[PDB]
Ligand binder design. Structure first.
Ligand SMILES: Nc1nc2c(ncn2[C@@H]2O[C@H](COP(=O)(O)OP(=O)(O)NP(=O)(O)O)[C@@H](O)[C@H]2O)c(=O)[nH]1
Ligand SMILES: [Mg+2]
Length: 160
């Protein structure tokens, strides 16, 4: 079994904990509880012909070097309804790079079910993905849309 440590970063309330808990535990709740300390969740999946255990590290976005240390893949998350979270993506990217260098990374626009309150045009999100040279997924944790694919992509990229 191959273990992969993955970090998930982004501004407060973008849905980092919701993403991780949906992926690992299959649930979603509407109430916002800011993450306390660092929470460790895991999921065992199959990639090709190999058992893989994804070790997902969760912490609040509003961070110690120990959180990033040894990270092998990274999700950069912003929220459909939070322009500041989108503007902060580059800052989060550079924070991760400064800690661990070049690791497989993916850009995620979460809360896509709230498109009526969107603060980011589709073309702006895609322009950011291109400028950062990152694969881009639109997710809804509430609807369980594309969450599995985000983590599968990172696991496949690490193993390749
Ligand atoms: N409509 C909708 N709400 C979502 C979605 N994902 C998360 N939320 C909501 O957004 C709020 C914040 O989610 P949470 O996962 O705690 O965010 P976080 O990035 O972990 N925050 P923190 O950095 O403070 O720990 C919660 O009210 C949660 O229900 C989504 O895809 N759609
Ligand atoms: Mg959280």
């Amino acid at each position: 079994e191959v273990a992969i440590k993955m970090v998930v970063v982004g501004n407060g309330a973008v849905g980092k904990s919701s993403m991780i808990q949906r992926y690992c535990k299959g649930i979603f709740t509407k109430d916002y509880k800011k993450t306390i300390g660092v929470d460790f969740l895991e999921r065992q999946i199959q990639v090709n012909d190999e058992d893989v255990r994804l070790m997902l590290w969760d912490t609040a976005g509003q961070i110690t070097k120990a959180y990033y240390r040894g990270a092998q893949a990274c999700v950069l998350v912003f929220s459909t309804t939070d322009r500041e979270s989108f503007e902060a993506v580059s800052s989060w990217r550079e924070k991760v790079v400064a800690e661990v260098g070049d690791i497989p990374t993916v850009l995620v626009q979460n809360k896509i079910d709230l498109l009526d309150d969107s603060c980011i045009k589709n073309e702006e999100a895609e322009a950011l993905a291109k400028r950062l040279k990152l694969r881009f997924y639109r997710t809804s944790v509430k609807e369980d849309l594309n969450v599995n694919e985000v983590f599968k992509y990172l696991a496949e990229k690490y193993l390749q």
